[PDB]
């Protein structure tokens, strides 16, 4: 008989595991506990800080919630109005010296006329083709072409998506983009060209909120703190090293064993297979594909430059920079970087030269967070990637050669994106049911490996729904039907349901 026994064991306290935990805690029926190898909950939704005081999420993290239940927990965790800042969803695409508003096609009036011709001609071809299309596109690349046409494809989505996914667009499926037909809005695009008009898809309605303190990682610390502490086990004392599926026991690094009746695993499914010592599942999970993420942070002296302004995130299809995305992280919260009165020396200038002085000087400061993808089809030289990113910032005119850099940050996250390869579903529909047969709910960004339901809210709800399936027999909608949950009003499930209202009488 094991050291600890519980009805439901949750491995991992990133968003998915915390969702499972929040729902278990709310139901307050079956016994449970949650473990994690990190002392700080949050997983890939955590936040780091540099010795100079610049915070960085694991790349650009922007919340777009599809669920009331997620809103209920975030509101419970950070309830005061100044626990959050609200921003319009402002983004641009860097293209031929221009910051083109997102989405790219509605803004090609900024491009040279010769290119507008090429773009509109291709989109005309695509519209005429879409009018008689009776088949669905099979690859990401076929979907891009059919929706954008050849010309607009080549400028943005094709070279951009290679830089994100670190695999070619011809190697990915396209079901993950949803059930909407790959077709051009030719009239809308052509109208903006005729009118010489730009127009981004943001505004008063198209907002996001960002935590005032602690970056994105602050949310999940705050949510985890609503859990009964004695049911949590975070740190080296919570690292799972062995899973015995046939015996329903888990072993921690410090030798502690935990018995379960149902297991919600939120670790990477390939790590799970290894921890189970199941050669068959190991072989199957190795057939999946993922890219690694390098996050580069650069802290800059100065008030925010006019050329930067209220930009939030930025896309980089071109090859004059290694990053696919930049975030003006200082625009998300004033507490993402030191106050103006904090004194820091200049480490270097953006062109790489030494500062004129070594003295500490005051701010204010602003901050850029960059993402570089890595895979076997796209290597990354870890020794030079920081300097390459900074050169990238000059090339894209985000930084002047003279701009003063006061903080740098680089970290590699091995499992960054679960790739929607052509083979992904063929592999997962083998892996997930074999685990399901052993009472293991493998869920999450890498627990279930589905990017289209791979955001914080999706993840959290994957945990919530898993628990609901285990206890109340609910359908796991987010797991199995991404287009469905992403397209509907998910308002039925709440942090206080009927069951708790009736029980309290």
Ligand X SMILES: O=c1ccn([C@@H]2O[C@H](COP(=O)(O)OP(=O)(O)O)[C@@H](O)[C@H]2O)c(=O)[nH]1
> Could you tell me which residues are annotated as the binding site for NADPH?
66, 89, 91, 102, 201, 313, 315, 417, 445, 455, 458
> Could you tell me which residues are annotated as the binding site for UDP-alpha-D-galactose?
59-60, 102, 105, 157, 160-161, 165, 180, 205, 315, 325, 417, 451, 455
Angle between helices 140-148 and 113-132 (to 10 degrees): 110
> Could you tell me which residues are annotated as the binding site for NADH?
66, 89, 91, 417, 445, 455
Residue of 190, 447, 469, 485 that binds ligand FDA (CB under 6 A)? 447
93 binds, among ligand X, ligand FDA, its own copies, none (CB under 5 to 8 A by kind): ligand X
Confirm or reject binding of residue 29 to its own copies (CB under 8 A): yes
Confirm or reject binding of residue 455 to ligand FDA (CB under 6 A): yes
The number of helix segments (H) and strand segments (E) in the chain equals: 16, 19
- Residue placing its CB nearer to its own copies in the complex, 382 or 436: 436
Query: How far apart, in whole angstroms, are the C-alpha atoms of residue 149 and residue 151?
Result: 6
Residue of 64, 194, 360, 387 that binds its own copies (CB under 8 A)? 194
Confirm or reject binding of residue 286 to ligand X (CB under 6 A): yes
CB of residue 172 vs ligand X: minimum separation in angstroms?
9
Q: How many CB atoms lie within 10 A of CB 307?
A: 11
> E strands of 176-244, at which residues?
207-211, 232-234, 240-244
* CA dihedral sign of residues 161, 206, 491, 460: positive
12 binds, among its own copies, ligand FDA, ligand X, none (CB under 5 to 8 A by kind): ligand FDA
What is the per-residue binding string for ligand X in 288-327, x denoting contact by CB under 6 A? Answer: xxx------------------------x------------
Please give the residues from 91 up to 120 whose contact with ligand X meets the rule CB under 6 A. 93, 102-105
Beta bridge partners of 55: 49
Confirm or reject binding of residue 483 to its own copies (CB under 8 A): no
What is the per-residue binding string for its own copies in 232-261, x denoting contact by CB under 8 A? Answer: -----------------------------x
Structure tokens at 355: 């500062």
Give the binding range for ligand X (CB under 6 A) out of 178-186, 359-367, 436-444, 458-466.
178-186
Q: How many CB atoms lie within 10 A of CB 99?
A: 21
What's the chain's Rg over C-alpha atoms? 24
Contact criterion met (CB below 8 Å) for 405 and 348? yes
CB of residue 373 vs ligand FDA: minimum separation in angstroms?
9
Helix (H) or strand (E) holding 112: none
Beta pairing, strands 98-101 & 91-95: antiparallel
Please give the residues from 62 up to 101 whose contact with ligand FDA meets the rule CB under 6 A. 62-63
Q: What backbone torsions phi and psi does residue 245 show, to the nearest 5 degrees?
A: -60, -45
Confirm or reject binding of residue 421 to ligand FDA (CB under 6 A): no
- Residue placing its CB nearer to its own copies in the complex, 378 or 493: 493
> Could you tell me which residues are annotated as the binding site for FAD?
16, 36, 44, 59, 61, 240, 325, 445, 454-456, 459
> Could you give the C-alpha distances from 283 to 265, 269, 433, 436, in angstroms and in order?
19, 12, 15, 17
Cα–chain center distance at 137: 26
Confirm or reject binding of residue 84 to its own copies (CB under 8 A): no
- Residue placing its CB nearer to ligand X in the complex, 247 or 376: 376
CB of residue 468 vs ligand X: minimum separation in angstroms?
26
CB of residue 443 vs ligand FDA: minimum separation in angstroms?
7
Burial 318-353 (b: 16+ CB within 10 A, else e): beebbbbbbbbbbbbbebbbbeeeeebebbbbbeee
CB of residue 364 vs its own copies: minimum separation in angstroms?
43
Angle between helices 15-27 and 216-224 (to 10 degrees): 30
Q: How many CB atoms lie within 10 A of CB 397?
A: 11
Helix (H) or strand (E) holding 415: strand 404-418
271 binds, among ligand FDA, ligand X, its own copies, none (CB under 5 to 8 A by kind): ligand FDA
- Cβ-Cβ contacts under 8 Å for 31 (sequence gap 6 or more): 5, 6, 7, 8
194 binds, among ligand X, ligand FDA, its own copies, none (CB under 5 to 8 A by kind): its own copies
Query: How far apart, in whole angstroms, are the C-alpha atoms of residue 4 and residue 259?
Result: 6
Confirm or reject binding of residue 113 to its own copies (CB under 8 A): yes
Confirm or reject binding of residue 161 to ligand X (CB under 6 A): yes
Beta bridge partners of 263: 9, 440
Confirm or reject binding of residue 411 to ligand X (CB under 6 A): no
267 binds, among ligand FDA, ligand X, its own copies, none (CB under 5 to 8 A by kind): ligand FDA
Q: What backbone torsions phi and psi does residue 471 show, to the nearest 5 degrees?
A: -95, -45
Residue with tokens 């279930």: 448
Confirm or reject binding of residue 293 to ligand FDA (CB under 6 A): yes
Residues that bind its own copies (CB under 8 A): 7, 27, 29-31, 69, 113, 116-117, 120-121, 124, 127-128, 131-132, 134, 186-187, 190-191, 193-195, 261-262, 468-477, 484, 490, 492-494, 497-499, 502-503, 505
């Amino acid at each position: 008989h094991p050291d600890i026994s519980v009805d439901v064991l949750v491995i991992g306290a990133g968003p998915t595991g915390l969702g499972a935990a929040k729902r278990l805690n709310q139901i307050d029926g079956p016994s449970w506990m949650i473990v994690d190898s990190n002392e700080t909950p949050g997983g890939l939704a955590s936040t780091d800080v540099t010795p100079e005081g610049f915070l960085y999420d694991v790349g650009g993290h922007v919340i777009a919630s599809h669920y009331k239940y997620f809103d209920d927990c975030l509101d419970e965790a950070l309830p005061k109005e100044d626990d959050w800042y609200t921003h319009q969803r402002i983004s641009y695409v860097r293209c031929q010296g221009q910051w083109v508003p997102y989405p790219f096609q509605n803004n090609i009036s900024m491009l040279p006329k010769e290119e507008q011709v090429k773009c509109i001609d291709g989109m005309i071809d695509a519209a005429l083709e879409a009018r008689v299309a009776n088949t669905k596109p099979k690859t990401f690349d076929e979907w891009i072409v059919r929706m954008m046409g050849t010309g607009i494809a080549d400028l943005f989505m094709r070279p951009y998506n290679f830089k994100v996914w670190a695999v070619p667009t011809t190697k990915m499926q396209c079901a993950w983009l949803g059930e909407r037909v790959a077709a051009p809005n030719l009239k809308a695009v052509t109208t903006n060209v005729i009118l010489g008009k730009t127009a981004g898809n943001w505004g008063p309605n198209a907002t996001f909120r960002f935590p005032a303190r602690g970056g994105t990682g602050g949310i999940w610390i705050a949510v985890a703190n609503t859990l009964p502490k004695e049911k949590t086990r975070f740190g080296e004392k919570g690292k799972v090293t062995k899973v015995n599926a046939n015996n329903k026991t888990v072993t921690l690094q410090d030798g502690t064993t935990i018995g379960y009746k149902k297991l919600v695993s939120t670790m990477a499914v390939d790590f799970l297979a290894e921890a189970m010592n199941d050669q068959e599942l190991v072989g199957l999970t190795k057939q999946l594909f993922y890219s690694s993420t390098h996050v580069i942070g650069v802290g800059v002296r100065g008030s925010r430059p006019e050329r930067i302004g209220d930009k939030c995130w930025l896309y980089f299809p071109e090859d004059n920079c290694p990053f696919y995305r930049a975030t003006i992280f200082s625009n998300y919260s004033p507490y993402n970087q030191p106050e103006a009165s904090a004194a820091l020396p200049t480490m270097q200038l953006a062109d790489g030269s030494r500062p004129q002085s070594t003295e500490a000087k005051e701010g204010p400061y602003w901050s850029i967070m960059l993402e570089v993808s890595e895979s076997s089809m796209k290597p990354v030289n870890q020794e030079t990637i920081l300097a390459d990113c900074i050169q990238g910032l000059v090339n894209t005119e985000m930084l002047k050669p003279t701009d003063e850099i006061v903080s740098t940050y680089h970290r590699r996250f091995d499992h960054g994106y679960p790739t929607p390869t052509l083979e992904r579903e063929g592999t997962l529909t083998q892996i997930l049911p074999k685990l399901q047969d052993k009472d293991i709910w493998s869920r999450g960004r890498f627990g279930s490996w589905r990017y289209e339901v791979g955001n914080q809210d999706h993840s959290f709800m994957l945990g919530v729904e898993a628990v609901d399936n285990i206890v109340n027999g609910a359908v796991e909608l987010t797991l199995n039907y991404p287009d469905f949950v992403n397209g509907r009003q998910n308002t039925e499930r709440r942090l206080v349901d009927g069951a708790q209202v009736f029980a309290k009488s």
